[PDB]
Amino acid sequence: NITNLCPFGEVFNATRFASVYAWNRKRISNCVADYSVLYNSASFSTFKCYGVSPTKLNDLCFTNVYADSFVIRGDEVRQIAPGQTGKIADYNYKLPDDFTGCVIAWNSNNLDSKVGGNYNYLYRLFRKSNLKPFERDISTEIYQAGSTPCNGVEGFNCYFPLQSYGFQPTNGVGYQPYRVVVLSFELLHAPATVCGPKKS
């Protein structure tokens, strides 16, 4: 009698995805994880893993699972990888060099794009320095590039750090919005709880 099957339905396909600059992090724990359905699903455009091969994900057993979700431009999915330099990787979501886990993404043009242009998705263009891996920035202080104390009074050479995505159906595949979910596994000095469903 297998019990406590871990849902994943409230995480993989919800009705509201967060912006990339405020990526939502939901802890997964005390779960009987089943990644077979995720692998056998044919709706994911990209599903490739580091450290752990997708075939045997049901065997190794982990203490905790962290899932992060956000929505990014179609072409910018290549920047979500260890040791990659880009714009969103350097300013929004930075991955460690020795990252363990993988990312799952699929096209979401049928929901995240509007005829008049969906303007509810943001991505940061400016900040002082590159952020260390696994960090979230939310403050909206104006990135100054002029001499004076900007004081946040929007104008010339006090540039707004945050700009919006113009998601519209008429653009190409490289510009279509994509929903990205990254699963991160770790091991630490604690008993392992979140792992596969065995078999019988």
């Epitope: 072409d75 910018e76 242009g117 113009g166 519209q168 159906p169 008429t170 653009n171 190409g172 595949v173 490289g174 510009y175 279509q176």
Partner: antibody
């Protein structure tokens, strides 16, 4: 996959004219057709595009005097209030595959629309 | 939103090579294509994504570049390459006007 169009005529300024581009050898509802034009001896210009779903986009320099309509096998375009600088050659272009817009790998033979008195 | 091609015209011998540069006013990732238009004929797609050769084209045409600077160079240009070339790339949407074409360059072989 063969794409052809016709409708070139000599018209006075301010008179509407219709060009119809007819598809052949594929399903229209899967690929996006677009219209481009070039003046005699000058560079290419972009006019507009219609995606497979039915949504349409245009060009700013056109200012919004064109209209692309879709149907079974007639990706037609209609203009209004033509000027004397619209004498050019028009093409209708097909795409490569699903998505990957603005590739324009199949082209029609080309038709010439001239405006004069 | 603005595409620029330099030089406008360039000539080389049959056993020679020439370069074509097409710069974009905005970051466009790698979404850029090239065309070849012989006089009186519809343009033919040569390279898409700025580094992938189209089907049925020769391997003496190569492309490169990413971001805002791109370059196309033909090696050992024959007498069949005498035509005009254009560069086209996407440019977001609302911000600008989807797609624009470059001014084009003319190539003549002696």
């Amino acid at each position: 996959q063969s794409v052809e169009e016709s409708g070139g005529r000599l018209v006075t300024p301010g008179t509407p004219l219709t060009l119809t581009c007819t598809v052949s050898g594929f399903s229209l509802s899967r690929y996006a057709m677009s219209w481009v034009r070039q003046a005699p001896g000058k560079g290419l210009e972009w006019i507009g595009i219609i995606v497979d779903s039915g949504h349409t986009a245009y060009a700013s320099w056109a200012k919004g005097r064109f209209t692309i309509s879709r149907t079974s096998t007639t990706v037609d375009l209609k203009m209004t209030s033509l000027t004397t600088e619209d004498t050019a050659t028009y093409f209708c272009a097909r795409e490569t595959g699903g998505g990957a817009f603005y590739v324009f790998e199949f082209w029609g033979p080309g038709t010439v629309v001239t405006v004069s008195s | 939103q603005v595409l620029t091609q330099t030089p406008s015209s360039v000539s080389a011998a049959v056993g020679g090579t020439v370069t074509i540069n097409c710069q974009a006013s905005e970051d466009i990732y790698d979404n850029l294509v090239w065309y070849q238009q012989k006089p009186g004929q519809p343009p033919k797609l040569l390279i898409y994504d700025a580094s992938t050769l189209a089907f049925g084209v020769s391997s003496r045409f190569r492309g490169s570049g990413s971001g805002t600077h791109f370059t196309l160079t033909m090696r050992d240009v024959q007498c069949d390459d005498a035509a005009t070339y254009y560069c086209q790339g996407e440019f977001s949407c609302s911000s600008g006007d989807c797609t624009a074409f470059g001014g084009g360059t003319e190539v003549v072989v002696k």
